[PDB]
Design a binder for this molecule. Structure first.
Ligand SMILES: [K+]
Ligand SMILES: [K+]
Ligand SMILES: [K+]
Ligand SMILES: [K+]
Ligand SMILES: [K+]
Ligand SMILES: [K+]
Ligand SMILES: [K+]
Ligand SMILES: [K+]
Lengths: 308, 306, 306, 308
């Protein structure tokens, strides 16, 4: 529900740990989940992009939700990534995730690849919102999907009772507009770490974050500053925060965040093809820049999920 | 193989006809296909983007491959859409297709959504080309998938002996470079009906077309003018073809092409959500522009959940 | 100097009122100016883009600088547009302006049309800052001039002791970096009324505004809310200001701003060709959106050739 | 007139030679002009971008037209660059260039910097076309000016009796359209060397060229092939032509062309600020790539026109 999510400020988009072997590392999950709740994660998004959802099987996403809900045991609310670029597959998975339980909302991306029109997107998300007990949060991101929902289409959807929010990654003009015209019980999250500062100042509810894995504190610190009206501290953190965000996305994500989470001892392991891990030479620069660690280095292989 | 496709000039990116209830209209396939082979389709690509592949299940795609192959009967070579943005799935499907047989190649798109690096794209396409008997054509289309293979990575892949060409949708600058440096047994298709004139001029092997569904004849006349060194005529055709291609892509494909095909009697049906058919006011514009037809809210459909 | 401008929050990019016959309306200047100083203009930029500088002759610009300075009388500091895309002309004009006196700085745009490299931009701006007593503010606006100063070249220039700031129209990412690494005695203005909220939040020194002509008060209220750490109120103001900025730039500036100023009695007049006034149907939209006014083909004018 | 220009295929956009000193090198002009007419230049454009027109004075452009017409002595037709982003200054210079004589047409760029609307551009070019005996050719180039004339505005203008053509640098779709709907006595030139092949196949009249300075022959060779219907030779030249075009624009033009013209012994000299010459390290790669010369190399300074 909107209620479960309402107070969230730092929703983390949780990675999927893997072994050298390509299988999921369910073992590394407990320590990672603890680290997040220790470093100001308000809520967890499961099986999103950062989780390499395109490469997780149906049954693997189900394993992941059980494994994380066991280890979170109710402590923060959760959102499941449910949408694909097929409306029927999205209807089926969400009704299924409604049954499964433990989620405050299903997240549904604007369809990638097939490039639907605004009416197409409207009828898409309506059908997914219609389908299930689980309300929906729309993830609008032309930087990954080419097309986008316009604010007008988005606010058409926001009126659906079962559509409770948006993870918006367009422009701060668009974001301003959405915050300005939102109906009630409708939540506006930036999905851009490097904008979170501006989105919060403008009246957004929060961030659905990658950088929260490795810089959750300084992000907390900046948000508290906005809330406690210390704009000088908030902007100082923001100015030093931007180059970290850029390093975390300087190779295709979640490669940079996994490499940092690997240095930090969390065995995030590699990425499943078609993603490959960050090159060693980038790996050192990145750890230095994002967590001011020193990486004592030593061509790079992505992994496939077991054939068997 | 490369042999099988060497000669194709117009390989058509075949639609999937759907019933008003959202099931495949398998009945419409024989008429539609004969119409293609009647209008200078030399080769057919099944379950590409224009087939609404994101919306076709595993089994549906297999059942399309049956229907089409039964009708085609080896009259032209066939290409199966096999790649997705998951490297393992793509491997498992290219094997199942190689096994299925009757395909000269599999088409594998550059991964959408997850935005791999070049090196990621190389490992992806290498693994697919390593998986099976079936040769691979890469589909590079940053207007659909955001990222793109640089020519440089493309040419590295061109060296894999089981990768035999590219459907290239980037720039004519890139397409020139690829023609220039291509190795042996590597086909270069444009995937952009609008630029097919330029691509063929520049030395491409042909076009993987949507337009060929409705405008095969004039495409044939242009390619013939081009190969007969009749440029004034090739370019007269190209200059008037541009708006028709434009119209075809003026609501998201394959809406406009189904709306024309429906108008020509072929029962293309509607599109599966998230795509919706072309709006009414637009349908008329589109027919008038593309086929010179006289025609007269919109509802996308779902696959049956039973 | 830097001193003179340290305190400015709202420096307005002053229009040039024109008569229907295309000569400067010098009569309108006193009323327009008093109106700015009445509405929280802290500093004025004369013969910037909004003044239609491409259309003002050398002597006209000098005569504007007279008129305005006579009216202003040292109540606020002044900035003269001095740079063009020719480095020699810019040098000769910044000297003539330094000589003219009464200006805290000269504004020099990144060269338009000829698309210099970074190194070319450095040599350009260095020579201008070397030429005269008069300090230099750089104007970086790739949406007008195509190329842009990277932050890196910008910070090299920031070190010249006669370059004292930037009117920056690139991205908030760049604007953050510049605030963070700025040396001493270097002012950072946003030139984007739309992003002024974000820029001030991020630690900018203020805005070089068009909107301040018509909406000075609410801009003042926002900047005050911001500096009084009243964010909910700052952002309420910003969220409703965005469409007004949008409207102001909805036909090419300064058409929309003159159309509003005309409606408020100020005789801004039309624009000099190649710019034409806002079309009629648009003028009404614009007034309603920007000032909440109730209003009711278009003709751009030429400077007299006699 | 349209007649003077009608048969032109390779219009060169002539550089402005300068001394180390910043003054124009009128001495180097004769040899450069000869080289062009020796290497298939059909027509010469004077005082365009390639000529660093933004940095030429009024009186310097007048010197240039006299100096080139003396040395061309009638042999090819000529076009003068007359437009600026001020309509009055453009009216005055063109009426003046009509008086001056020896030009087949005045070239007028879509106004840069002030970003006019379509009506604005329309009224702009109408006024310049109205002003003088010299007909006008429009130079539409958003890559330098941001804005552009749409085909609809452009064809509105093409109907003016005194507007005889366009140097179009947008897309080949746009170019196709213009060739398809042109009125009579209206000429379509690409201003893109790297597209000239495609523009010619599509039915364009010609190219207004930079690369013609240093690769005029191979350009002739490709155009003859199109005309004589040998498409295989034309495309072979095109494919090897593209990387030369890219090197000629790999540093801000006319820096790369001047550096090659400097290696070839023509003393093009440096560029006037804000342009600077090409870096040495780029200078060798460029000469190699464009004219397969070997540059025996030896931080880089742009020059100002004399203060005196
Ligand atoms: K999945
Ligand atoms: K709702
Ligand atoms: K499928
Ligand atoms: K191969
Ligand atoms: K001026
Ligand atoms: K300074
Ligand atoms: K000039
Ligand atoms: K004409």
């Amino acid at each position: 529900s909107y209620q479960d999510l309402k107070e969230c400020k730092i929703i983390t988009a949780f990675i999927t740990p893997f072994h050298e072997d390509g299988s999921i590392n369910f073992d590394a999950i407990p320590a990672l989940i603890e680290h997040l709740l220790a470093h100001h994660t308000d809520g967890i998004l499961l099986a999103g992009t950062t989780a390499e959802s395109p490469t997780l099987t149906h049954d693997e996403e189900l394993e992941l939700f059980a494994a994380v809900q066991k280890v979170v045991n109710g402590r923060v609310p959760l959102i499941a990534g449910v949408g694909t670029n097929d409306t029927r597959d999205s209807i089926e998975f969400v009704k299924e995730v409604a049954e499964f339980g433990g989620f405050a909302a299903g997240l549904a991306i604007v369809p990638y690849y097939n490039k639907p029109s605004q009416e197409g997107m409207y009828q898409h998300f309506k059908a997914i919102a219609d389908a299930s007990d689980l309300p929906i949060i729309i993830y609008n991101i032309p930087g990954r999907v080419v097309v986008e929902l316009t604010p007008e289409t988005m606010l058409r959807l926001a009126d659906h009772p079962n559509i409770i929010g948006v993870k918006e990654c367009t422009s701060l003009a668009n974001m301003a507009y959405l915050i300005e015209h939102k109906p009630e019980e409708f939540l506006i999250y930036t999905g851009e770490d490097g904008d979170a500062f501006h989105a919060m100042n403008l009246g957004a509810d929060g961030v659905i974050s990658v950088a929260s894995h490795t810089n959750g504190d300084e992000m907390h610190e900046m948000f508290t500053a906005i809330a406690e009206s210390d704009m000088k501290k908030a902007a100082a953190i923001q100015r030093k925060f931007i180059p970290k965000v850029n390093a975390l996305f300087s190779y295709p994500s979640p490669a940079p965040v996994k490499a940092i989470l690997n240095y930090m001892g969390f065995e995030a392991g590699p990425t499943r093809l078609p993603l490959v891990p960050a090159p060693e030479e980038d790996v050192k620069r990145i750890i230095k820049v994002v967590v001011d660690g020193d990486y004592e280095a030593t061509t790079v292989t992505g992994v496939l999920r077991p054939d068997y």
